[PDB]
């Protein structure tokens, strides 16, 4: 018996057209072969090694499981397929490729920019903060702004704002820190020496730093 590996299940093939971005489980009664393409993904690798253990468990436990990396086939094995047939293509992956960082909201993070203005409401408690566009073009000086960067939180205080506006900006930035695990340090920029603040808008909304070596969950195609 021969099966390509798809998601977690086994799709039966009887044509021995071996591919390089996948994994195939070959069934011989007392020895189970699993062949891992040189260009497949982890899920395809590990589903093979899992399925083989379920099969040997069903079989009372007397079968031997032979893992074999591509290009390294043993004669014992190759003499079951052939009276070199290795293609280049794949069967898909089941993982969802995420990128990650210091906070779990990472791979979907867009940096946010909010505005706070007391001109529209009376009292602090009535005030609200409104998302504006993540761009220098959205900065007025009559009011204050807060940039949620995930890693960090920047505050920009306009010279022509009021105490109430800066108090809301602080409140909101400390709230962001509170509601998101790990520490998100608050940095206040006064209008005038605001180089790094504008520099962050210049890094755009889709800018996030992570270190943490990123990896890709699919064959190379």
């Amino acid at each position: 018996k021969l099966f390509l590996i798809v998601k977690g299940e086994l799709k039966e093939i009887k044509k021995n057209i071996f591919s390089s971005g996948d994994v195939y489980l070959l069934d011989a009664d007392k020895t189970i072969y699993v062949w891992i393409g040189n260009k497949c993904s982890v899920d395809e690798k590990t589903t093979g090694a899992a399925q083989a253990r379920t099969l040997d468990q069903q079989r009372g436990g007397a079968a031997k499981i032979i893992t074999i990396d591509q290009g390294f086939e043993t004669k014992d094995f190759l003499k079951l397929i052939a009276p070199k047939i290795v293609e280049k293509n794949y069967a898909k992956t089941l993982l969802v490729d995420v990128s990650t960082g210091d906070w779990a909201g990472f791979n979907e993070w867009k940096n946010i920019l909010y505005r706070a203005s007391s001109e529209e409401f009376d009292g602090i408690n009535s005030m609200k903060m409104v998302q504006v566009g993540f761009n220098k073009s959205s900065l007025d000086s009559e009011d204050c702004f807060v940039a949620d960067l995930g890693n960090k939180v920047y505050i920009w205080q306009g010279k022509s704002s009021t105490v109430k506006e800066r108090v809301k900006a602080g409140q909101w930035a400390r709230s962001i820190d509170y509601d998101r695990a790990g520490l998100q340090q608050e940095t206040i920029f006064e209008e005038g020496d605001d180089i790094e603040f504008m520099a962050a808008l210049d890094r755009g909304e889709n800018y996030k730093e992570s270190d943490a070596v990123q990896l890709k969950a699919e064959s190379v195609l």
Partner: protein
């Protein structure tokens, strides 16, 4: 519904959802308590801190490792950690998500039973499974039989597995790993003039390790090359615009893995422990183990460590052995990856331990489950 995976590592917790290709939440498995007690009154601090916030507030807190050396030893702190993972890091209610935990090799039955008890009675998880870290790493490599070298933050293990089962007579534990390496890099840097006293400066050293250090192929020649030339030096810029030059430290630090004598340990290097474990296995399977040697953990990430391990191992093994060392690029978190894959699989769902079964047979049901 979507299942949860949590690798309770010795120094970092890696948690995330089943199906993702990486742990979404990674944070230090550390809990700090005020050290002068008068700061929970007048300066208004909370009773305990977790992870990043605790380490930041090092200095007014005593930090303790619930899972120092891989085995959980404080269930109050472990509860704080897990609560943080579910509610603060992942932002989910664990009663709606099955939870796969990982355990260190040579974990006591009582330890795993208490883990089980705590998950069900304190977090109301619908179902849970506990797996062995090295086994998830092995499966992730694409293999079911091999020997894993798992080097993490506070403890390092050699683990041999045949057809999916660990061999506890031959499982090897060594109390040297990344954290001792960071400490040693700090010591030998301070022996050149550089000083790291602020909390920031102490985290800088962990960064230098992870970014600049590498494993020398032959320690003698590499030490000589650094002594006679400057080809091997490399520079690291501190925050404050001052720059640091680091030279032989880059490879003296990780060499401790092979020469524990560097930090005053009387013990064996990772190559030797791999050898002693393999020889302590069934005589018929040693060939298969030599040919399938998987490396997992954060401390197996130094460049050129695969080469050095093969060298020292082939020098140890018989002349006629076909030796191969497996270091997949995803090995830092292979454990977690395994859980994520395994929990998503269709064959696995039959193995999930439900709350009903816990109610029926007590906490010992967890022993009666295969991978």
């Amino acid at each position: 519904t979507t299942a949860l995976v949590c690798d309770n590592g010795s120094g970092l917790v890696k948690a995330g959802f089943a199906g993702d290709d990486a742990p979404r939440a990674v944070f230090p498995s550390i809990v700090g308590r005020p050290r002068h007690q008068g700061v929970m009154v007048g300066m208004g601090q909370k009773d305990s801190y977790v992870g990043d916030e605790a380490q930041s507030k090092r200095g007014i807190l005593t930090l303790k490792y619930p899972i120092e050396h891989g085995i959980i030893t404080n269930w109050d702190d472990m509860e704080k950690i897990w609560h943080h993972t579910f509610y603060n890091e992942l932002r989910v209610a664990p009663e709606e998500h099955p939870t796969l935990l990982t355990e260190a090799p040579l974990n006591p039955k009582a330890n795993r039973e208490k883990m089980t008890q705590i998950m069900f009675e304190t977090f109301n998880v619908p179902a849970m499974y506990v797996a062995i870290q090295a086994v998830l790493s092995l499966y992730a490599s694409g293999r079911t039989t091999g020997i894993v070298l798992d080097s993490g933050d506070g403890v390092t293990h050699n683990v041999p597995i045949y057809e999916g089962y660990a061999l506890p007579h031959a499982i090897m534990r060594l109390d040297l790993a990344g954290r001792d390496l960071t400490d040693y890099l700090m010591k030998i840097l301070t022996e050149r003039g550089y000083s790291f006293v602020t909390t920031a400066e102490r985290e800088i050293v962990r960064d230098i390790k992870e970014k600049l250090c590498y494993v020398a192929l032959d320690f003698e020649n590499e030490m000589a090359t650094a002594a006679s030339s400057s080809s091997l030096e490399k520079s690291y810029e501190l925050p404050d615009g001052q720059v640091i030059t680091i030279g032989n430290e880059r490879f003296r630090c990780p060499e401790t893995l092979f020469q524990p004598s560097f930090i005053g340990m009387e013990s064996a290097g990772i190559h030797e422990t791999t050898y002693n474990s393999i020889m302590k296995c069934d005589i018929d399977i040693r060939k298969d183990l030599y040919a399938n040697n998987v490396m997992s953990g954060g401390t197996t990430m130094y460049p050129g460590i695969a080469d050095r391990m093969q060298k020292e191992i082939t020098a140890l093994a018989p002349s006629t052995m076909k030796i191969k060392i497996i270091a997949p690029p995803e090995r830092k978190y292979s454990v977690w990856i395994g859980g994520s894959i395994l929990a998503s699989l269709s064959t696995f769902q039959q193995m999930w331990i439900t709350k009903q079964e816990y109610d029926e047979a007590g906490p010992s049901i967890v022993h009666r489950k295969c991978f």
